[model samples]
Target chain A: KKVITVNEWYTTTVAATMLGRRPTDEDAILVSAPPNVRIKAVFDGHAGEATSQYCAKHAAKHLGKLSEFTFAEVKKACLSLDAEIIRKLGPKHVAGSTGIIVAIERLSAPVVENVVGREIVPRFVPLEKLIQEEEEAVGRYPRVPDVQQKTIPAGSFLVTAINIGDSRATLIHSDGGLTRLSKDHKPNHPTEASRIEKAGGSVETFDVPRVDGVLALSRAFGDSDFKMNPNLPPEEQKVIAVPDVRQFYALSSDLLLLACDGVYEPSGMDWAYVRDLTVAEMQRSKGDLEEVAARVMDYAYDMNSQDNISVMLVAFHNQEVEHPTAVYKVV
Target chain B: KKVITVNEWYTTTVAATMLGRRPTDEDAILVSAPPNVRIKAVFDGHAGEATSQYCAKHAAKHLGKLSEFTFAEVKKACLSLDAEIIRKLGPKHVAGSTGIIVAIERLSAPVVENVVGREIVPRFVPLEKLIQEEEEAVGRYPRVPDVQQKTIPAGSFLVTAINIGDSRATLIHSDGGLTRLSKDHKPNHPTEASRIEKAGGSVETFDVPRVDGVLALSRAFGDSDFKMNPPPEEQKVIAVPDVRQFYALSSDLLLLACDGVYEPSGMDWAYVRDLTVAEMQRSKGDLEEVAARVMDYAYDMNSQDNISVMLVAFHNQEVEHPTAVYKVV
Candidate 1:
């Protein structure tokens, strides 16, 4: 008798970066996938690569130490990293970067004890007593503080996304529904425009909406020229490093896409098209996530995107599907 | 036998103007209340009274000549009056004015024929035939062309309001409900700002949002300096008028006032509507006293500009003094 081996499909994480038509590749990517933790980010740099490179090297380290994945904690980490960027790069550097960081914290519910196996114990623990014991158990395991005790089942995962500038973080469900985890900060947006105007700055629409006819984004990591207002704090500058943080749970067969604005700029790939293409390439590449991400940027470049492209794809595997060892590869 | 005379109230219109704290009363008022047609307007002038005076004297006459008071006709009359103001005053004149013109046309429907008595001729006439006859009658008297023939019954009145700049036209209903017939055109308003910016102009905030930091109102009769470009309606500061039309309800009041009645610690429409209602009850519908009291309130409220008020009442019944429950808090 002869034994044959069959390689089945599985889920994993992959990322890709491309210089495209730009003279230098200012865009950067970060991927950290441990046994029970997954952190991915992409930074879209403008003027130079200094700020984006700095974030790529140090952002995960700042987030990995967090005890839980929370919107507030992730937002603080992003803003903290931005302050470090400004301090290290100084107020004279004109470079700034857009950050889209997605982090996932895998959690396990408390194990249940089977009291029915021991008949010598009390036949009935009383429903009230059982409920009280469960309440104490929940109070002890207060990892997901906001979640209801009933909802935090076994193998639950909390996902946090921190966004700034025009980069996007989208969660694609298995049913092809999309949930946008980030909203791009544009200078002409009503809130952004009002803030800029109130801060003694103007939003001029030359080519695109720009703050004082300079930076296009209303929020970013380090644009020191705009942060030079003497009377206002760093948070109230014409262009600030404020991030919009969003948090959700990772569902089975869900995929997370974190990409720079190059994928959604004029004449770039749209959300539905990218989603369909990702699904098609995932099957064609035989669950090779790196090849799927590379194909996405290749499509964006083929569409004549004028800037650098960077994409990070994180696939959440269903337990029923084949389980290959979770591996993270940075490309 | 004892003889008693009851002082029953009657509907009428009145207007008042005050120089307030201004050096001169550049504001002007026009009131033309015939039996059927009612035309009232208020003009707030800036720089000088040339434009406002021209509108006060000529706007009603131009509107009165119209066959029917339609929004299109009234708007055309307003724009024509503005053109005449610019041409007569010349492009060098710095004077401009905001015009709020309200015109009403009372209409009468066709009379029903007493065909029952003369039964032998059309006793067996089909319903379709009668419907056709009524349709032909409506087509013959197509005065309110845009209005549905079914809605335009006897004693129907169409009120058309043409607004330019910040002056307001409000229709206060007998139920204390207020319908704003005009919207103030300020430079910072979204549409106004877009037009100003597209016309190579900017809206700067200096105390108030101003077109090029000069004129606060975005639409006015003549600001020749701001309207220097050859473009027509979308100029930096345009004289384009917005017109609205609706059927007049019985016992409704039409209040027209300059921007002085609405800016710089001024009384808004709701407050002014309630005050006018209270003043009517207080004076037993003496419109002159009501108009005077409104202007007085505005003046006392510290309106810095010249104030003008015009009120027209469409009361179909005798005025009654209601319980004093009105409070401006």
Candidate 2:
């Protein structure tokens, strides 16, 4: 069995050139196929600058090291990394960070997961699949600080292991089947919105701003004012992350994209257009995987995306090759 | 000392057949004495059935007697008669009574005084030479339960007394001087309306059903339900009068009336017309006095006034004597 894998990446700094202020694009991604293991991930940040950098720098490092790690272990590792980042750079600097991660071991089943903060959506596509596979998790943060703190259980990391926040993860099986695995933590979600409102906050339109014209986003991680209530446990904190998990199969060339909310927040275009553009770019670049990923980001930015643009594309360039044979036999 | 006396009187009543109905005639009088006293009086009532009978009886008793008594004494006497009638007949048999009285005594003098209530108004005209006469204490009697209990101190009374409500009362003296003496009680009386609303009540146009819809007369005497909350001792009660009182000058050909007088109640006719007709009739054969008096009852019966009527006329019978005069000296 033989397998062809191509990786490509790009970063554009949108400086304050437009208004003379240095713009910080906090979106980042990491993709590493170590020996027989494969991992692809995207980090989307909405709040402060540092949290996004933390995820971008460290998320893939642990995932790449333990490709065979269980979902729970991967989540714990991510949490440890989060703690380390927060310790190195006080809590104030780590405001909001959201991300999506997809890891495949032996290509038998790809475990897709995410840890989201404010808003981010992730999607996956199986090889030769006519429809793009989609699983979305957006704004799953708790409305109250105490509830949010209580919700983050031990061994729970936003998307990889014990997924939390607003993120999505999808696993694509090689047989063209797909599974979804994440949820959007909307403050308007009946239970969450009510909790926020009863706690003297409001769930305004789309959970931004309050029903009483106060507070924005009913539940959000890292908003200390909302977290001060001692009556709530961390997991039951008003700010919460909805855990979602699913599984699927890939029949044709599989493609997955984990994007920041800014791409779809203002413009509802998601995997639909992103997949189309990626496929088109692949055709234009003659099946070059790196080129496809670059084109996806280009289109998103051209649409005036206000945040960091990150993406990863994996084209199963070779078929008729089983994953176990390709990996164990390649060396 | 010789004194010239001036007085004004008005009387109106509903026809006997028109009890509990509207009246055809409404009687009103405006008496302006060039130098001192000015009086504006109105009697709104059902001009039907015995309404006129009651108005005639009271006007005859009080209009002529006013010159002989002080304002307060006249009121006391009127109130006494009210109790006498109620006592004689009992509450159930006493006819429905409603009227307004307003008298400005000694208008321009420093001693000028004003008294208002639902039933009657009385005043004294000092024979000009007697301007310096000893001031007399106007006597007051315990208000008769029937009349005092039913009387409602309302806009009409205030208007008749000084012409004011959620509106302003303006007293234009004989010299063109103006004085606002009463406040219009209206549902829209800013502060008052809100209070009523907060208390689970509302003020309808010209009637506040919650307060029994008696046309928003905040201060009154006699309406038991409304009188539940009595005003301060010096203030008025909230009820209707079973009987009313008033004193007009006999020399001025006084016209006195009660609620049954259709002409006065509806504001459709001029006071002078009623006065002219009353004055033209003979003192011995003054049918207009009785006519005006009975008119209220008649109107009440026809219009379905809820009360009775009464009216009286004081006219000049000859140069040496007024129709209702009696020599005191």
The DockQ of each candidate is 0.00, 0.00
CA lDDT of A59 in candidate 2?
Answer: 56
TM per candidate comes to 0.41, 0.33
Q: Per-residue lDDT for B159-192 in model 1, tens only? A: 6778888788887777776666766677987789
lDDT of candidate 2 over A202-317, digit per residue (tens): 66664463433543344332333444445764335454322223333332344444444554543655434554565566568885444455565556566776555544444443
TM-scores, chain B, all models: 0.76, 0.35
Chain A of model 2, TM-score against the native?
A: 0.58
DockQ, candidate 1, vs. native dimer = 0.00
lDDT tens readout by residue for model 2, B183-250: 23334455546655554455666423323354445432222232223222122222222122322232
